[model samples]
Target chain A: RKMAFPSGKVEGCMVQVTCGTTTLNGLWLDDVVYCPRHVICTSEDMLNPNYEDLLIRKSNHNFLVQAGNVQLRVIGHSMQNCVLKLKVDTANPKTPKYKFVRIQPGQTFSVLACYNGSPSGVYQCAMRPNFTIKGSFGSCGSVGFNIDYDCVSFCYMHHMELPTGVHAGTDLEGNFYGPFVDRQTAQAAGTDTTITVNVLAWLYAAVINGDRWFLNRFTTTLNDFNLVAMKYNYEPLTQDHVDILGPLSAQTGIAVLDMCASLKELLQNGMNGRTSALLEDEFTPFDVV
Target chain B: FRKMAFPSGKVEGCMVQVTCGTTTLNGLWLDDVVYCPRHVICNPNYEDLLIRKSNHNFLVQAGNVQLRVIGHSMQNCVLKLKVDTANPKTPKYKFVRIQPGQTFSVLACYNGSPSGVYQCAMRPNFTIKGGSCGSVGFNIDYDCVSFCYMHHMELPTGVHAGTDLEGNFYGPFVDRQTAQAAGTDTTITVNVLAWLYAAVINGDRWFLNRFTTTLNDFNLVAMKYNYEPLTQDHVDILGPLSAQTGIAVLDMCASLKELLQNGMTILGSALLEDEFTPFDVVR
Candidate 1:
């Protein structure tokens, strides 16, 4: 089937969002071009102090970003009564692009992600939250992927210290996401089902790249998503427990690389189909390549 | 160094509460100058507040905090929703009342139109393709009243006690028009009790001022709610509000001025919110 965007090599890395000119300053700006409700920004948009001023007037713009590496710094600008919509663009070729959307009051924000370009390697990165200080870039050329991310954000009060709550939604147009995996559904899972478990990725806390992020986007954002999650849930093969493996798996740069690489292998293997055996962590025995 | 009592006149940015009918009263607002979070109207009975459209001719528009509306179970709450290419000026949709919990939602990805209007029956649920899917891509959820979950983070009621994340506990909706902003004869009508509620609650130190972040005192002076059932001539003046026959526009802003000034809590109260379960009598 034809795709809106090119589908080729997939990779992930941390982004830097700050004020002023820096590679990490701006969000990736993509609307009516790539993914739906997407953010398109070169590095500079993040640095531009008056960026909100421009977009404030422009309206219906989505700013793509990832959370974790850093706490999204609050630019000392004042926006009256609106907040940003945060999510990972798992449908995009870049595994998952942390996406942020901004809409002005009177106007309606339209959803338009249409790609007519010939598929090729996808280069995508997210803001390096100030919080995650150390991490290296993880990218290598390879054949590609599909993305699905739930829409959520950090509430204004920043008052509640909560974990990321996973809300699942299929990436169909205009679909409001899901029933949010209710208690009844959450319970009936382990017991039984005719065909494999039908699970929807839902989140509570508002952070991507956090714990749920690994449980989720790690597999949900990757190719062969169905196969990956099935293994990870029932057995534990779905993107082989990164944080579950160890702390550094998420905090340290080496672990970031390890997990990212592990993600690609699962992506490669899940597409070829899989078994619980190969979904092992770095600690497992391996032969030198 | 002054005490809280009655200041005679309008309070800009004040919570505007209007209690429709005999059941109970509810408040609503246009957040240009005031910041009354939408959830304040969580009084399950009659779903107290009816929201005015944000982008319409108003002093300011609702920002990040989308102005969430209320839900109604009555047939009167249902309205026609057209998604055709009616006109460039046509709105995405008119704001609906709390008639059977309505949620206004947008889609994730789209090749063409995201959806067509489904036989909603009694919901704000999105109709995808043509069939029904339990999953809906909505930003706002409707329970007692319509509210955007984003406003207070979690569902507005659960933790904050119906207060917003900012810790701003509101009492009533109040937008004043005095001689300075209008003419010496200028006046905006409102319910007497609602007006008093606005004056007292906002006047208290606990109700932090959005701008100064300090204690606020009762600053309202004159008052005017429309004639109980607004005389035939005055009805249209309220615009869409006239549609709510249940609402009695009582303009007693002047007479009640002193009662509020005297500081009387004789008959005043407040309550709460929760989820949006499609109300099916059978279920």
Candidate 2:
């Protein structure tokens, strides 16, 4: 007897079964019965979870990085500074570009690469120097003096440490006095001397906490934009000045079309017309660069 | 103890001195010890004289006190003294020399008192003494003529003198009414014809423009003359006149008439952009 496929195609079909003395054959054998049961499968790579099985199985060497769909590998090294080399691949058909950098001792760098059609994959790496307390400062636990660190976090992120031999203080006007090399420089500059290690510490903390700019000689940050906007009772529109800030020759497009229209209205009518100006134009579109 | 002398000193700057000897009544000086002479019961030590000096008279009774008036009588003569013997008895009189060194007895009966203390003032017909009636005291008498003279003629303190609309020296008057009176004072009054002549000749648009156009708000004109941009209030004050005259005249008055006769030159200097109908005064 022959069997049939799941597509209902008879393959050399013929079968026979007997429940009594009469012989069953061919077309009657095609109606024979069967039983149902469950099926299961497992993988050793999934069981291990941490193993780089795909890349290892594809190549005999352990040099390639196989983490999920992305593959990374250390390709080669350069001379002198002994620069590290790497290669990366995504599932995209386009050949990926690569860039390598050498960070000296006590330096850190952040990298943001394109992944999954967006700017993702933020990474920070540091090459810290041999860390030593080096020397004591002021009194114990006092901020009156500067402590030297070979691999302080700021020195690791930037290229410099807190200024040395500097003891900073505030003047009568509350302006920062100095992180100068000596008191002679502090006295000579009088209130004009502003840089201070303590102040630098505060600024570094602010930067780490997401401050993007320093507005004044001391004590101001980018966060003041939001503060000033809230104080003046308006959405800060100064950010939308890309058109005006971009180029002067291109006059057709300008930022905040509503502000431009209002300014034009003020020029035509008297300043007193501001009271009767229509509020409908306030929420109008801004021009894009 | 029979007599006592009167106190000797000047009485109100006129000198006088005298004595009484027979008027005494006890071992103490008789003038010092006596009670009323007709009393049935008497205490000499307990009694005292009531003495009063008023209007140039010394009144004394019921005690040992001698009341005498004597000094150099620099004026007229003839001094009189009268005694009343009983309650209803008619007074008996005596006369004494008023000249210097003359002494006379002032007597009374044991049961009677002197009729009264009266003096014949020398020369009663002379002019009445004390301050004169016409001395012009604080509440001085005044008529309307004097009142108006003071109210109009006197320049009040603290106010500075300035020329009024008619070019009169108006103020330095004590109060506003007096200051205002300078405008009406007959001496300063100019005839209406001469007043108009002065106003025109002085080119006092500040004075004449009030009648010509009621749009001279001082602050507005001052600011506009100073080249400050016009405000809504200024526009309101000027709108009434601008509708009548052309805006050229408004501009002239607004800039304090500097642009009146020579329009185009001053208008060019003003650099004004407002549209205005031309008005020609040459017509």
Candidate 3:
């Protein structure tokens, strides 16, 4: 089986972390470039503020930030241990990275760290887990992982007090954002859930970052969203992906990175894969990086 | 039917008895049962003052009420009945048989609506050249239009009783009018009585020469009422103002006028009393 390991000599396998950028902000395979997963190859256009605005870029002595207090969750499977290394730059192949943060435990470990502000440029996060699981729960099987990001500014965004006594609907002229949650479902599928989860973590982070900047742009002009709530989906597209090739590629549609093709189509299907993906006919060069 | 019977035990020794009805002419066996000498000798059956004279006859007003007459026998005995004419609950009126050119007043009252429609009715009580007495039918000659509540706040067009927050009490008029033609011209006039707040009431007094309109004027003239500010307080103290309340204030005219004239009369009688006589007579 073909495997993807970072170029490094260590006791454990290596996986270089690549934060998204305007040109390369998604997950991809050999010749297929797309969003979080199998659903559709997504891009910034489908997002309100566009995903490019959220691309995290850091250079030597510079760090990237994920502000606006967005919460992102990371899910991992079948990993003995891992280390997440923070490097300010990949300019010099021999430049000593600032940190080699070990993520040890047969189970899983979690971290929520802020970004570096001024020295902000290109940066990378790499993972080195001790060993890997096999396919079909088999060696080299699809490792399951998922990402979920939730915006936090929605907590206290009301101006007036709630109405008292009997009143008509007009009294609530501008109130209540419908029931919308900021999360995505995590499920395992044939041989790919693991890498998918890692990719999703960053994608979810990017989505939240997109929301943060979007809010800032509108704050001066539109006042607060009074944004009652919002809805988003990071699921793979099934119909068209399968039609192009087969179910193997079709099921990859679940990630927002993939759904970035068009937000309207995603919204129609519960952002689910009810219809088909019209992604291939019009492919951009930066799509498959 | 509802009679207060004078039993023998209570009436055995009553004094100054004067009987008029065709009953056993009960007389009090008092210091003296003064018998008329002419009736004593005129007929044996003619007991008491029953001689069937041309000017005397028997009549029962409300009930067969006999008062304890205390005095020497004169030609006739007068019974002073302490009737409450001022009770709005009861019908009371002092009718004066007026001659032509004499002035009279018809006190305006709250006849239901503050600005109510009034129909002046008349019956040719006496013989007229063209109209018959018993055959005459009572017909409305004119109707009075009701004015708005504010119009009557000042110089009331017609007669009225005064009222305020404390309560409504009836009294006299601020102004009076006279009849024009003879032939028993029972001219009728109607006007509206309004309820006003303190400022309006005070304005009315200043307009009517409050210092002089005494009969019931002072009570209506002086506007003092406890107002409840909060909604809770209103809930506790709220009640409908009797229709008579506004009229009662108007009724204070006589008293108010008197107060202004002498500046010696007391305050409460303006609210309590209905009639106005010379205050100097009371002292």
Candidate 4:
């Protein structure tokens, strides 16, 4: 009579679970057969880090930031009035805030936070027009160091609307582009401006990270890591949902988090032993703190 | 310090223009036409070549075009002519169909057809270059055929042995003399040198340590290197000395230690790894 617990136990641990088995005695009585099917494994087993999940974990967020000085570049087509404000923060009790800053277009900025104990928070950046785009980016998963970064190339008056805006806005305006899942469709009917959204953002992140550190960060193929997203679709992050993307972006800096950082070298490249380095590493010691 | 040079190239800017008569096919004109790897024989299409009256020979372009290149060339394999132009390799037979005069440079490009090559010809006699030669006078010269590989952009990695021409088993150059002859048999070499090095060294050392080990462990031959003994000698060595005995002083063999050490030590230092001790180097 071991399969009687109210809550579900592993497949085979029936009669052996003493105290807990008492409640199951009458529900389904059987001879004393003990076969514990449930086995224990590391955290990676129960919680697969691949793909997007919605489990709101702890937020003792740690980061490894490398704000490579303040890069100053001319903003927009003609208007040089825009100022780039790169921020990083958490999304759980609400959207997070800027943990790092870099205003120059040429200067790189980076931030690392132990969001939910890992870099599981949303990170974003906003441009308040002197010619800028506001509220455009959303949370990106942490790179290897739970890190996020950016380099402001322009300041345009563009506002970001999460959830509904994630896709609609980017697709229409050709401003915020991303998550290019369909290469053919995107290729045949894609815009030029959006193609650089993820590429530039990651490049911004990369330059910040690279200039900060001093090694080949994305050595897989300079061409492979070139981000090619079509538009910003923040349906993955909304206020009603605990996964607030804007806060993640506003506080984190990068538009999206790349998961390849956590991969074993064997997984990234077909050729073994050859190193695949991330450009930036030693810039201001990323906030492992 | 020795220096390394990087490769660079200059960008040639040219205008794309439609060249349909007014001007003749010049040196810069690209008579190049790329063909797909595969050809689909189907319905036919036609184009009329107008040659206003000169020798009263009106050139009308028409044909039962069954073969056409899809990818880069897209245009049919053969360029039909109403009136055959003699000396096609030059001006009269010069290829003039392709326009944008500037765009028709080499048929293959990085993003274009990295695998495909193009054929170029003058007006009357268009010759297909880069691929097998077709007949010179036309009418599907050399069986005007086209090849189309379904899996585009995929390079051969030698996985499916027989399918791809590059596979190990059925590749060109299959012959006996290509392999080295060892002992009485032509011992085909497998690149298992790591394990071989280990085994040879191990065997040589084992026998040499006692001096009783025969030379068999090291492939030590009685004759010179690359020289093979006759079948009779092989039979004698392999044949048993049954019944009683012959003065075939069968020496106790040692492992291939010394031979291995000498070979491996030199090779390893020059190119091998320190951590790889024979077995570690094997799959």
Candidate 5:
């Protein structure tokens, strides 16, 4: 019996990715099963970097980020905040946090992605310090350097509570504001509320309702990676496709079609990509610390 | 920029005073309501004329009204006066949408209805936002049949509230009596904080990132008190709080002294980690 993990595994968070399953009864929401069944994702944590859990490849314009047999792709136009930076770290020296790379909005160069089987566990990933493309940001003749990157979940399955008073707060009189799970009665009365709160509430409620993310948001639009794959699955693969196996593996990893972020876009905008960059090689260096 | 660029005194939903005498019905078409897109399904509880057409005429029974000139005025839709006159017995005339901003006016027979109150009321829409139809007028004449209104105001006699028509939406309301009573015409002060809010949310269409502070409830009030005249003491509140919370906050109005102090929750849903807050995913 496999347990469904909402995102990044716990101490033993690792689990095999499947195309689809009955997540309803097995999800781990901290200590509870996220709500009787549904959602192995919500937090924007990056798909795990372990090779068995992740894979990557690129063609002319299609870049695929397949992790844990789940897949999410990057086509040409994904707005200002849909880029992932591939770079190395110098601060941590050698450890889990050292070589971790992340994808966010406004990114320029992608790291030369390679799975260094050299390390073990999830953190075994590392960054090599040199690069072929020596130009910084748009400096004259810059082609492509083998940019590689690996990832650790952004929150790693742990949901964060942003600092109040800062992002949202109370006035001198002290009334709660910013974003929150709007009170149900408040919604029924059509009470005035910020769209941010309303939207956040909806996403929260729907996800907890079990499988609503797929049955609702993803099903209606976006997350149609399989729709495209199955359409192509009708045919067999050639050796070139096999050598790269870049795309087919997407079916295994199951990330979604990065057609764009989610409708959560308006609120999530500009915030996604700061993570804006991950400078791993000579081209990059990083951390939130 | 809500009720943007309309004649300073005009806004959607407000009632203005005028002569009960004849005047061009076209004068009621303020750009705020006239240009307002009828496509919006929001604020269904309220209505404003959002269409027009030329050559539309009135179907008044005197003390009367007009029936055309709003965009695409409904044809043969004119069913007034005759509604009560045609064989005043069982009735012969029919009725339809007296759309907001369309041709609904009073072509009073000079002395037909006698002198009464001619107020400029915004177009009402049972078609979209709830309510009946009009001149933007108010009836002060005894025995004159008036209409229903869907109105509310946070403050009494607002700058744009004009003369409030008596209505059912609000309870035990004191109706604006006449020429020199409580009205939206003068002595008005704009709620600066509320204005900026409507500007961003509705005016700029929620370009939340365009401005510095997040438009949450507390922030709105904070902004209100931060106005130069008051809350000078509390002005210093945002800094210490910002440092503590780590969310960028506006320091413009902060009092270096007040900044010395100040302090901030998430959703309560099973959807997130119990500790999960709305923006927890950002970090």
Candidate 6:
């Protein structure tokens, strides 16, 4: 098949050329404008303060950052073994944090690293494929690698404190940021399910960051959500939870219903796509980075 | 019907309770209770006093008389009164009377809008004539033409129940009005009550006093009333009595204006047309 090239047009069989540091041979092309077979794009808006566009421009790979904390997952699909190099710029005069991982064809490798001292900031990842087959050439640059892999970088604090209680912490800039949820909600509605589900996603981030105070405070709200969740045969309560609650209340033989009606209503609305997005929208992970 | 006895004049309708010798009647059992269309009865229920006799004019004297208010309901005992029960038609008065163990609403006779002072032969035949009864002093300048003001100054109720942030209660005066009149920094108390009326109106205290701290300050007052600071060459229009009174001058004026408007409404007269037209034109 006739393959398109930046320099000139050529056949797929002779798609190699000597360019600077390395020589590209066979179906492997040189550093030319192209989109890979497994190219990945992201929701990183350039205008956003938390945009990781700088690192994405560093190399061609799937870059997902959670609060500036870096985590790389390298997936290899080419017929060659690849060596991926990850670097984190702390902005300090000190040396940058580094991690290396090797992935075999049809295999994946993961690396955990931090940007700044506390795992927050910019990062870059690059890899070179070591081809073993005859007529196959090894590319020395980022685009020279023969790898169809997915890599993710978590640059943010994931787990956030639930709104059940006050959870305060300082950001990377040493400015106070959080108890993502206020204790007022807890005081008002004993256990808020809406706030609980929101904190569930951030719980991972919080757990990784060792935010025990937040976890402790959010226990009550979590417990209520879990009970409602289990009774409805779901992890998160559904619309039926609001529906069959009366039945359950009847089955339990209770006249006075003292259930959290607010939670049930939230769950009923939260079960929908639009409302779920709205709920997720409110779950703004403290972007201190 | 029970038989009733009157002292001198021939009896009419069973309207008012009149005393004859040692006996008391429910109402004048003679004819219709029509003496005068504007003749009102001032039932001063301040003490155990009731209407004894009248000259059928502006004078209706009251004395120590027993007026029975019997309760009817077991759950809720209410007393409703049909004012001027004798007339029963033109300008009938109906009001709800609530009290513990009271049923029949008692009609206390007093006060009327008159151009001149009339005799109130309660005991010493005191001259009884003033402004509207539904006022701060019970009788204030209801008429727009008359500039007659009844100035009763005193301290405030706060001083009597005074206690700082701690629990120190204060007071050596009769009441709030008395403390205000006693003179040591009574400006605040006077102004506050006056401003209280203003505050009750449209919450103008925010602009009027600015804050509780700046309440005693009269810079705004000077600006409001278009008057200069107490000038050396200026003469006191209100005299020393006005200065001694713990009366908030501006607020008093504002409240008086408010009171006049209310009285005008009660009298069914023009608010700005008759009285304030000249002042409005000058302004």
Q: Please, what is the TM-score per model?
A: 0.19, 0.12, 0.12, 0.17, 0.17, 0.14
lDDT of 3 by residue, B139-185 (tens): 11112111111011111222222111111111221112333122322
Docking class of 3: incorrect
The digit string of per-residue lDDT tens for model 4 on B45-162 reads 3222222212222111112111122212123332222222222222212222320000111222221111112221111111111111111111111212111111111112211101
Q: What is the C-alpha lDDT of each candidate?
A: 0.22, 0.21, 0.19, 0.20, 0.21, 0.22
TM-score of 3: 0.12
**B-chain TM-score, candidate 1:** 0.18
Q: Tens digit of lDDT per residue, candidate 5, span B16-96?
A: 111212421111222211111111111222223213312232222222333132232211111111122221112111212
Weakest 10 consecutive residues of candidate 4 chain B by summed lDDT: B1-10
Of candidates 4 and 3, the better by TM-score: 4
Where is model 2 chain A poorest over a 10-residue stretch in terms of lDDT? A32-41
Off by over 4 Å in 5: A1-289, B1-149, B152-169, B178-283
Which is better, 4 or 5, measured by TM-score?
A: 5
Model 3 chain B: lowest-lDDT 10 consecutive positions: B131-140
Predicted structure 4: lDDT: 0.20
Q: Judged by lDDT relative to the true structure, which candidate is superior, 2 or 4?
A: 2
Report DockQ per prediction, comma-separated. 0.01, 0.00, 0.00, 0.01, 0.01, 0.00
> Tens digit of lDDT per residue, candidate 3, span A1-289?
0111111111001111223332111111111111111111123433332222222222312212221232112221111111112322122222222212222112121111111110101101111121111111001101111111211111111111111110010001112122211112221112211222222232333343342111111111111111111222222322333232222123332233232322323333431322112111111111111
DockQ category of candidate 5: incorrect
By TM-score, the better pick of 5 and 6 is 5
- lDDT score at residue B99, model 1, on the 0-100 scale: 23
Off by over 4 Å in 6: A1-83, A86-222, A230-261, A269-278, A281-289, B1-283
lDDT of 2 by residue, A166-211 (tens): 1222211112222322112222222221111112222233333344
Q: Give me the TM-scores for chain A across all models, comma-separated.
A: 0.18, 0.17, 0.14, 0.15, 0.15, 0.19
Q: Write the per-residue lDDT of candidate 6 for residues B1-283, one digit (tens) a residue.
A: 0000101000111134332234322221111232211112222331122233323212221123222322111111111122222332222222221111111101112221111111111001111111122111111111111111111111332111211111111223211222232223212122223223323332233223222313234445534433223222112322232243433344344443343334322111122111111111111
Q: Please provide, for model 6 over A168-187, each residue's C-alpha lDDT reduced to its tens digit, 9 standing for 90 to 100.
A: 21111112222222111232
Give the distance in Å from residue B50's predicted Cα in candidate 2 to where it truly belongs.
Answer: 99
How do the residues A25-138 of candidate 1 rate in per-residue lDDT, one tens digit apiece? 112222111121112233344233243554454322233233324333232222322212223333223233433332111111111111111111122111111111010110
